[PDB]
């Protein structure tokens, strides 16, 4: 991530604001509907629309992304805890992170149309790619 990329990410996440958990839940609901194979990682969740488990998990996902935005210079240090979870414990297939990052970009573009510029789109794709690389590491 370049200085211009970091600047776009911090700016875009500021417009998100208090809607992070709300957007993180939608991005999950978009993932599960568009890519049903991702459902196999949440067999204990009820994945119907309006499920409290999908709402709850979307908040934890958005909280993790906010932690990553505030620690853009040290993503491995800010996400070492979740990297151990998704790699050793959960063994999530790396293809799935591309599916979630796409679902997040679709959600952000849907709610922030005027701020979702091509320059920001490119920066957010590169941020979500770095976040994934950290979680797929180890």
């Amino acid at each position: 991530l370049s200085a211009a990329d970091k600047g776009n990410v911090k700016a875009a996440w500021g417009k998100v604001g208090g809607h992070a958990a709300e957007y993180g839940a939608e991005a999950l609901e978009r993932m599960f509907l568009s890519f049903p194979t991702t459902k196999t990682y949440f067999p204990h969740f009820d994945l119907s629309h309006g499920s409290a488990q999908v709402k709850g998990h979307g908040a934890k996902v958005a909280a993790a992304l906010t932690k990553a935005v505030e620690h853009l210079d040290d993503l491995p240090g800010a996400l070492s805890e979740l990297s151990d979870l998704h790699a050793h414990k959960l063994r999530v297939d790396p293809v799935n992170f591309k599916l979630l990052s796409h679902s997040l970009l679709v959600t952000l573009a849907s709610h922030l149309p005027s701020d979702f510029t091509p320059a920001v789109h490119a920066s957010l794709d590169k941020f979500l790619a770095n976040v994934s690389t950290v979680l797929t590491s180890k």
């Binding site: 939608e26 609901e29 978009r30 509907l33 568009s34 890519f35 796409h102 970009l105 679709v106 959600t107 573009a109 849907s110 709610h111 149309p113 979702f116 510029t117 091509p118 320059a119 789109h121 490119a122 794709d125």
Partner: protein, 143 residues
């Protein structure tokens, strides 16, 4: 399916291929810069504003979504609708089929930005099936 087909076709009548096409192709060239390699004759692609305002990009992007609109009317024969385009992208342009999925994913993002709450998750999921089929039909000649 039939109910998915009817919802996807009804939503497509509201899409202005003119703009959505030029934005989808421009965003592909910006977000995934290695695809500029195939459009170097288009001229100035050095900046984001240059790509988005490039007249040939806006013009080509309209043709891509027109080709997309043609596949929309043949959802039960995407392999035959794009058979000529598959030969062009595979035998002549040598575009890696991974990029068809990239363009289809950018198109979905462009639709989500231009329609907001109307681009529901259920509707997005149906459109992901189309862009997966279009990308597969365009990658048919590689197999």
């Amino acid at each position: 399916t039939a109910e998915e087909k009817a919802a996807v076709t009804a939503f497509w009548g509201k899409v202005k291929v003119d703009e959505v096409g030029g934005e989808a192709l421009g965003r592909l060239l910006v977000v995934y810069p290695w695809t500029q390699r195939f459009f170097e004759s288009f001229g100035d692609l050095s900046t984001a504003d240059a790509v988005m305002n490039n007249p040939k990009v806006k013009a080509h992007g309209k043709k891509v979504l027109d080709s997309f609109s043609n596949g929309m009317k043949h959802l039960d024969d995407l392999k035959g609708t794009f058979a000529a385009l598959s030969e062009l992208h595979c035998d002549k342009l040598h575009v890696d089929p991974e990029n068809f999925k990239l363009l289809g994913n950018v198109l979905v993002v462009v639709l989500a930005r231009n329609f907001g709450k109307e681009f529901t998750p259920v509707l997005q999921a149906d459109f992901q099936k189309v862009v997966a089929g279009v990308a597969n039909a365009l990658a048919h000649r590689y197999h």
